[PDB]
Amino acid sequence: IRSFPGKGIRVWGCRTLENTDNTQWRYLQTRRLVSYVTAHLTQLARMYVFEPNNELTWMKLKGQSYNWLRQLWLQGGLYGSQEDEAFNILLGVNETMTEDDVRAGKMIMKVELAVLFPAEFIEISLVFNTQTEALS
Amino acid sequence: MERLQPGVTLTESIITMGQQEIPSAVPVFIGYTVRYPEQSEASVRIDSLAEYTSLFGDDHVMMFAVRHYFDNGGQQAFVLPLKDNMPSVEMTTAEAENLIAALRSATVSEAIGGHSQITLILVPDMARLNDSDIVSLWSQGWEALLQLSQVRPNLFVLLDAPDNVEQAQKCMTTLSSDYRQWGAAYWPRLETTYQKIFQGTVLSPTAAVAAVIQRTDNDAGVWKAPANIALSQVIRPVKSYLQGSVLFNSSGTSLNVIRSFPGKGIRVWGCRTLENTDNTQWRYLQTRRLVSYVTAHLTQLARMYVFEPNNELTWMKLKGQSYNWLRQLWLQGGLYGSQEDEAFNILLGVNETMTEDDVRAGKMIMKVELAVLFPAEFIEISLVFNTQTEALS
Amino acid sequence: LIERGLAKLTINAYKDREGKIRAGTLQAMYNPDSLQLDYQTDYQQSQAINSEKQSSIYVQAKPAGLSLELIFDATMPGNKTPIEEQLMQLKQLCSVDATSNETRFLQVKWGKMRWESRGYFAGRAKSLSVNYTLFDRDATPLRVRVILALVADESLVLQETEQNLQSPAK
Amino acid sequence: LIERGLAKLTINAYKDREGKIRAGTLQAMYNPDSLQLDYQTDYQQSQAINSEKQSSIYVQAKPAGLSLELIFDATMPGNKTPIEEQLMQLKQLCSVDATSNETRFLQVKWGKMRWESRGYFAGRAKSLSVNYTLFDRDATPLRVRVILALVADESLVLQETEQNLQSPAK
Amino acid sequence: RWESRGYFAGRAKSLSVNYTLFDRDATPLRVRVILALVADESLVLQETEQNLQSPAK
Amino acid sequence: NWFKMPGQSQSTNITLRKGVFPGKTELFDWINSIQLNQVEKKDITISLTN
Amino acid sequence: YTPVVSHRFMASFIFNRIPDPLDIRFQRISGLSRELQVTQYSEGGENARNNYLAEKIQHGTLTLERGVMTVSPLTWMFDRVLSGEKIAYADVVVMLLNENSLPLSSWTLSNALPVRWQTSDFDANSNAILVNTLELRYQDMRWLGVKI
Amino acid sequence: YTPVVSHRFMASFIFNRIPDPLDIRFQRISGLSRELQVTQYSEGGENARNNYLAEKIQHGTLTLERGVMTVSPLTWMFDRVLSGEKIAYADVVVMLLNENSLPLSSWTLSNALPVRWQTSDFDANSNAILVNTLELRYQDMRWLGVKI
Amino acid sequence: YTPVVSHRFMASFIFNRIPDPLDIRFQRISGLSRELQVTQYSEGGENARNNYLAEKIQHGTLTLERGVMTVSPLTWMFDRVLSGEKIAYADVVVMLLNENSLPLSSWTLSNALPVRWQTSDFDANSNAILVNTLELRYQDMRWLGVKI
Amino acid sequence: TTVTSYPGVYIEELNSLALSVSNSATAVPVFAVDEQNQYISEDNAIRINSWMDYLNLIGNFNNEDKLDVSVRAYFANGGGYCYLVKTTSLEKIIPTLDDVTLLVAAGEDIKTTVDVLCQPGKGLFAVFDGPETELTINGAEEAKQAYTATPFAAVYYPWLKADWANIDIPPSAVMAGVYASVDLSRGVWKAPANVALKGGLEPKFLVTDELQGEYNTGRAINMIRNFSNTGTTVWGARTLEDKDNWRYVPVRRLFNSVERDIKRAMSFAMFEPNNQPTWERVRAAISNYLYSLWQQGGLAGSKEEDAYFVQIGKGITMTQEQIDAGQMIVKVGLAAVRPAEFIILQFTQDVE
Numbered sequence A: 001i002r003s004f005p006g007k008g009i010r011v012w013g014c015r016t017l018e019n020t021d022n023t024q025w026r027y028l029q030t031r032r033l034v035s036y037v038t039a040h041l042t043q044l045a046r047m048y049v050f051e052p053n054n055e056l057t058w059m060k061l062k063g064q065s066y067n068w069l070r071q072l073w074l075q076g077g078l079y080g081s082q083e084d085e086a087f088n089i090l091l092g093v094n095e096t097m098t099e100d101d102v103r104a105g106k107m108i109m110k111v112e113l114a115v116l117f118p119a120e121f122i123e124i125s126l127v128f129n130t131q132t133e134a135l136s
Numbered sequence B: 001m002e003r004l005q006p007g008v009t010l011t012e013s014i015i016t017m018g019q020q021e022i023p024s025a026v027p028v029f030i031g032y033t034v035r036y037p038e039q040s041e042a043s044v045r046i047d048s049l050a051e052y053t054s055l056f057g058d059d060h061v062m063m064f065a066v067r068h069y070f071d072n073g074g075q076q077a078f079v080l081p082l083k084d085n086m087p088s089v090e091m092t093t094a095e096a097e098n099l100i101a102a103l104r105s106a107t108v109s110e111a112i113g114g115h116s117q118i119t120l121i122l123v124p125d126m127a128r129l130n131d132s133d134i135v136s137l138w139s140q141g142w143e144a145l146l147q148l149s150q151v152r153p154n155l156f157v158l159l160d161a162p163d164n165v166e167q168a169q170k171c172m173t174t175l176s177s178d179y180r181q182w183g184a185a186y187w188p189r190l191e192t193t194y195q196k197i198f199q200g201t202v203l204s205p206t207a208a209v210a211a212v213i214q215r216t217d218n219d220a221g222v223w224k225a226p227a228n229i230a231l232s233q234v235i236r237p238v239k240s241y242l243q244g245s246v247l248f249n250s251s252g253t254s255l256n257v258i259r260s261f262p263g264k265g266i267r268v269w270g271c272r273t274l275e276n277t278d279n280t281q282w283r284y285l286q287t288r289r290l291v292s293y294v295t296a297h298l299t300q301l302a303r304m305y306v307f308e309p310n311n312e313l314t315w316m317k318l319k320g321q322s323y324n325w326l327r328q329l330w331l332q333g334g335l336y337g338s339q340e341d342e343a344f345n346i347l348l349g350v351n352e353t354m355t356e357d358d359v360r361a362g363k364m365i366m367k368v369e370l371a372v373l374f375p376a377e378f379i380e381i382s383l384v385f386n387t388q389t390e391a392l393s
Numbered sequence C, D: 001l002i003e004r005g006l007a008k009l010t011i012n013a014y015k016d017r018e019g020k021i022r023a024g025t026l027q028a029m030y031n032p033d034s035l036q037l038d039y040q041t042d043y044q045q046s047q048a049i050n051s052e053k054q055s056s057i058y059v060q061a062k063p064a065g066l067s068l069e070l071i072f073d074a075t076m077p078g079n080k081t082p083i084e085e086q087l088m089q090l091k092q093l094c095s096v097d098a099t100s101n102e103t104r105f106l107q108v109k110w111g112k113m114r115w116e117s118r119g120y121f122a123g124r125a126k127s128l129s130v131n132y133t134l135f136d137r138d139a140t141p142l143r144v145r146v147i148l149a150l151v152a153d154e155s156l157v158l159q160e161t162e163q164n165l166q167s168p169a170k
Numbered sequence E: 001r002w003e004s005r006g007y008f009a010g011r012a013k014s015l016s017v018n019y020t021l022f023d024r025d026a027t028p029l030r031v032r033v034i035l036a037l038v039a040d041e042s043l044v045l046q047e048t049e050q051n052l053q054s055p056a057k
Numbered sequence F: 001n002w003f004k005m006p007g008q009s010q011s012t013n014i015t016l017r018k019g020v021f022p023g024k025t026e027l028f029d030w031i032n033s034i035q036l037n038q039v040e041k042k043d044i045t046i047s048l049t050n
Numbered sequence G, H, I: 001y002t003p004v005v006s007h008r009f010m011a012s013f014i015f016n017r018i019p020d021p022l023d024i025r026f027q028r029i030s031g032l033s034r035e036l037q038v039t040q041y042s043e044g045g046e047n048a049r050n051n052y053l054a055e056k057i058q059h060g061t062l063t064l065e066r067g068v069m070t071v072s073p074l075t076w077m078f079d080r081v082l083s084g085e086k087i088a089y090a091d092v093v094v095m096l097l098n099e100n101s102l103p104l105s106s107w108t109l110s111n112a113l114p115v116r117w118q119t120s121d122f123d124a125n126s127n128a129i130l131v132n133t134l135e136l137r138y139q140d141m142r143w144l145g146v147k148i
Numbered sequence J: 001t002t003v004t005s006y007p008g009v010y011i012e013e014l015n016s017l018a019l020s021v022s023n024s025a026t027a028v029p030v031f032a033v034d035e036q037n038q039y040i041s042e043d044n045a046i047r048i049n050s051w052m053d054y055l056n057l058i059g060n061f062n063n064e065d066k067l068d069v070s071v072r073a074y075f076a077n078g079g080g081y082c083y084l085v086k087t088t089s090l091e092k093i094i095p096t097l098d099d100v101t102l103l104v105a106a107g108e109d110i111k112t113t114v115d116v117l118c119q120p121g122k123g124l125f126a127v128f129d130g131p132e133t134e135l136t137i138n139g140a141e142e143a144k145q146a147y148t149a150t151p152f153a154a155v156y157y158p159w160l161k162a163d164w165a166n167i168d169i170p171p172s173a174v175m176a177g178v179y180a181s182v183d184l185s186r187g188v189w190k191a192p193a194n195v196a197l198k199g200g201l202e203p204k205f206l207v208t209d210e211l212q213g214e215y216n217t218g219r220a221i222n223m224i225r226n227f228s229n230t231g232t233t234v235w236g237a238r239t240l241e242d243k244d245n246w247r248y249v250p251v252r253r254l255f256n257s258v259e260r261d262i263k264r265a266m267s268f269a270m271f272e273p274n275n276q277p278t279w280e281r282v283r284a285a286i287s288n289y290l291y292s293l294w295q296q297g298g299l300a301g302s303k304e305e306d307a308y309f310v311q312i313g314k315g316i317t318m319t320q321e322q323i324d325a326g327q328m329i330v331k332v333g334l335a336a337v338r339p340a341e342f343i344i345l346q347f348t349q350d351v352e
Helices: A028-038 A042-048 A061-073 A099-103 B049-056 B061-069 B093-103 B106-115 B126-130 B136-148 B165-173 B206-219 B285-295 B299-305 B318-330 B356-360 C083-091 C156-166 D083-091 D156-166 E043-053 G073-081 H073-081 I073-081 J051-058 J068-077 J087-096 J171-185 J249-262 J276-295
Strands: A002-004 A008-010 A087-090 A110-113 B027-032 B044-046 B077-082 B120-122 B157-160 B183-186 B190-192 B234-237 B257-261 B265-269 B344-347 B363-370 C010-014 C022-024 C034-045 C056-073 C105-109 C121-135 C141-152 D010-014 D022-024 D034-045 D056-073 D105-109 D121-129 D132-135 D141-152 E010-022 E028-031 E034-039 G009-014 G033-040 G052-059 G062-067 G090-096 G105-119 G131-137 G142-145 H009-014 H033-040 H052-059 H062-067 H090-096 H105-119 H131-137 H142-145 I009-014 I034-040 I052-059 I062-067 I090-096 I105-119 I131-137 I142-145 J029-033 J045-048 J082-086 J102-104 J126-129 J153-156 J160-162 J201-203 J224-227 J231-234 J309-311 J331-333 J342-348
Touching (some): A042 A061, A061 A087, B061 B077, B077 B106, B106 B136, B126 B136, B285 B363, B285 J342, B299 J342, B318 I090, B318 I105, C056 D034, D056 D083, J029 J068, J153 J171, J276 J309
Antiparallel strands (some): A002 A008, C010 C022, C010 C105, C034 C056, C034 E010, D010 D105, E010 E028, E010 E034, H090 H105, I009 I090, I105 I131, I105 I142, J160 J201
């Protein structure tokens, strides 16, 4: 927590306790975003527990969660230039689950999602460029 | 100034400029470097000088050609280094043969012919033998270079002319290669503004012309001639302009000259290939580069349906896609026609170009004819007096 | 390129011309559809008894004028900020500042839109036109169509140093 | 929230600017559809022979202007108050008060509509435009479309204390 | 030819940019400028049109 | 000039008739096999014999 | 569940809170539509999805025709308002009917103003019933019951 | 490959992220169109080929009618918004169906605002089902699956 | 000589100079019209014969519908441009066919911008193929071959 | 896999499964498996229906194994269910296995097996790899004769490299995906060259055109190489034999895709009374298969009588001594399409 003159007392740093061996939950906002999309996909997946587990109720789950993750992506939340670069979900009977996991009564949804970086270091370079003025 | 804590810490490392990626004009610099550290590839792509100096050493003649190429406006380039030793301050005749024998070698011919992105080649190290070389040694280097531009379709060679005027006229006449239209020679060596303003370093001219070939490709296309455009970091041609007025020959082989206009800068003056005009069609540099631009963009259309059934259907998909592209090049001011049947014509049928056995052998024969334009290098004023035809109102 | 999200219009009011004191911000609910910038220059034509040469002299370059419209809403289920809160925030930018006895200096900016080589549009509000429609039966307005009209008042210490790089002394 | 009922437009005429004497009220039959508030500020651009800096000074902030239309009716079976009674009540608010030799000060208010941080719109009537249509054959009018145009005249003891909370002495 | 000149020599009297259709990065993708010029021609050109129209000799 | 060309091929529906038999139920389980969009399409060969 | 048929209906009128049970026989009734008016607002960089803003609700217009019959308190109401005497309101209760002549759902149409009244044309050449295409504009509609 | 038929479909509604599985029986659904608006700009000496400039995308309007049934959470939603109580959004999932009642493709219609609601007319002279032509405006459409 | 029939045709697309040979099966194609716009100028004492002044050429709009099939590189192109991702051009080659499946004449439609895309409506009451009425605006047309 | 106790939602993570979509086609690659692999038993052929079913078998993915990077590049491109057979028992299991249309040398040497396995009577078309070292114009006679000259095999030289793998990726992995992705899209008769490679696959060695001019003649070696316009792509459609009957793989692969679908189209004729009404029921079961193949553009020609012919009958093709031996001899002919390998472009300068 730093004291800037003229600018107040400020929080300086958004880091979790972490030893970075290729870790993905390095910043505080990445851990809180990925736990925000678990706790709002469980609220969508709770709505049709005890449903017939056919091919119909997966397309109502693959459709409602794709429509919410795109709604989070179009708020500037998921680091993508197109929607197939930001996130992806898969639910099919030959993609995520086996034939026994349907018999056991479980759905397996595989949500992958990209996140953003917080811009904590800034590096100025200061190069001189009368080389390329190129005689008008 | 705390460099590990989060904040704004300025660095000395130079990051790259946003490249524009001009596809049809990109050079190689094949020369001796001092470092040679790259161990993965054959010929590597550089973007800036500060990237080059970390990657190929410092203080050599090939660096000042790259440094002058990035000043005139070029933005991407390849460097294929020669693996031998860097020469002395002056080139001995025992060592100058070691360069031209390395230019005929397949070690540098496979790196150019395998990469298929380069559209023109150049040696900035040929002007290193301009002092104490001894005339035919220059022609032995040009015949090596023009042969090197035959390994694959789209290649051109910008090449240095000797500064001595008697040596230039002899190497123009006694060249005698059958591939002369792929080259172009720019005569005087430029005295750039790099040290050793008082004694500026004398430099090859072709490193600056490859940037203005790339610069006129960005805006006015390949069909525009690269002459009459200003050069950035040069003080003067080291030879006078009036001394080289015998280098241009309208009937023989003409050599491009670099002129100094007062108030208007140092300019390239002349867009001619090495050519002896016996009804030749590849006389100007822009005609050779336009017709090789429409081969290397019709092969990209004809590659898309190799291994297709070779019936009457897949010819009309080839006669339609190439007619639609050549018309798109004609409506940019590229092909000299008042109507589209005057500019170009293509034919593909089974009774027009190919025989019945060439379908059985599995080949298509497309016949593309195309007209080109002329560069307006001479202008003739007539000045006639015309109160004869005022005709009493 | 990096991300995909809406940049929204923000109007920052400053008490001074240079941009040092801050008076408050206002982010737009929905962005304007169109932005119209109008420039104008006055030329007077020189009259002379002797000659008939057509030569018009330069008198003055009138400042730029940006004209944007906004809409504010509270009917929809997505938005819950009331329009009394936002229209009080907007009129406090087109307002006579009691510190300096003038109006405040606005800086409209959004995204990568350069307003002819400035990241912001520095200027003050020349007009403002609220058009309330569709009230609730509690008489809270649920739709408001503001039309802003600004005129360019740029800082002087910025314009002092553009003249020096264009025509230097040495 | 608490209840569900129409808030209706009321115009209270005061004889003085501060709002202490009352001159009479008028509640609207049907509310206006739309309310248009128009602000305006005058800026003069400084001309100078030496420099070419674009800098427009501040001259005056013109007062606000509210423009609403009303309708009065007696055709329908629900309403029975005659329009001669209501148009006499409305013209007595846009009227030269014989006590103060000026017009009267109106305060338009309805519901939770803040007119940019005031619960009322204090100002006097600048125009008034009655458009009688659809008379009975007794020549009693049964439809009347008034267009009011007000201009803002706010109290001075309110505006004295907004300057002190914005720029205090200590 | 702009009535016997290859160019239209003059200065800009007005200019009216009308931005429409921004990206959501707020980069504009369509702009409709309206230029209004007024003719300011050179004087050494107009000095010699009078001499060929009404010569001294 | 009265040009005549044959155009579109017209549809074919054949009608083949059979008495019912006490155990054999063969034509019904073909008209019962159809759910919404597809049947198991077969091919018919008719041939005059010895 | 299972849908209902559209040829059992009765419509009774309420003249100044006095019901009118003589006039329930009608040939057809227009079917009651209401619509929320919508202003589309396109904005800014969002040029890939629309954005619709709600507005006031626009109720339909109720037409209902019957064969011309003996004069009734319904006909004396339309003749009173369309001869310029009195502009009065009348509430309409339109209900579906069951098989046992019980109502399924009813629409109450408060303060319906009688707008127009049109008979069919006479013609000597064809045989048809003279009908009374009479059309009235309501200002609110309150659906009531089961099976809407 | 081979085309599909257009008489197996179901449409389910999502009222505030709570699904509505009671209201999947519909007579017809309008078919989903979207259109890129185009401003043609003709210019200069190019008077032999057009030049079209893209603009915002204009989504269609989804109409869907059903026989009138017992009152349901779909009907309580339209009646709530078209009586001026609450302007609320509802997401629609329209899917094709296979022979085994599996979905081929589904269209998710995010934030669809219920615009209008119209019943068929009563008439004593003809026998037909009372239908509910109810039409709602969506602001985005995200196609999902195989066989679009 | 003798005329040709209008029920053999194929249309192939060119996505960024990469041909698309999966999508040649179409139900119908709109037929290609172009029109020279004409300004009539009547003048002076010449009031017995018209005088037409030429103007720019106005090309038609190409509509083409197909049964809805498995998702293809054609469908991924329209979905990419009508979801606001990328405004890209696609060249269309529409050709007639002979009896031996040889092309008679072909129309190359350079830089055709995909404008709209509309499916047929679902309805439970009638049996028909779901079609994809998809319509795209081209900016030049270069007829090529024999028998135009 | 987590055990389930309470009815609800479980938020358990599983990093980097590298998940691919399940695909359905008709091309079934027998994958040769090196003997040092542990999750295979010999004299057994396990079946892999999707990438999740292989990943269920091995547990977790590592880029060291020559098989693990092989089946990822297969399911990234074409998919379809594949049979993982160990090499030392591959000669017993492939004649056992039905649904075998192409035998993939994953990263192993099968040249001794294909000589006894691939026969004219069978229905296989093996594919194996070129050398993993660089080969030049000078070594064109040495590595060309390292393979046999059977017309039932194709060789792809440049081994692949990908960003997700460490060992080089053998090209018969991806070329079984390409054979299964092209047969679904363009049919069997189109050449499996001139198609892109998905999954981020890149060739190890750059190939020139003057290098490929020597490996296309005789015992041809097809090659993949990247171009400026599209990226990496397959650039060969020649089998090993250089006679005009079986020179191109689309000819050999169509005749192999015909026979596997004729012999299941008229498999009803087994143990039927061998007289004349069995024969015309056989010639009609073939003829409206070949007509349905004719209309899709699979055969060359313009009529149905230049396209194919089915001729059976007593004395036409079978003798009387062939009747009481229990033999029905059927003669069927086809006329497939040949691809256009070369396109030459003649550049006149003077337009008439």
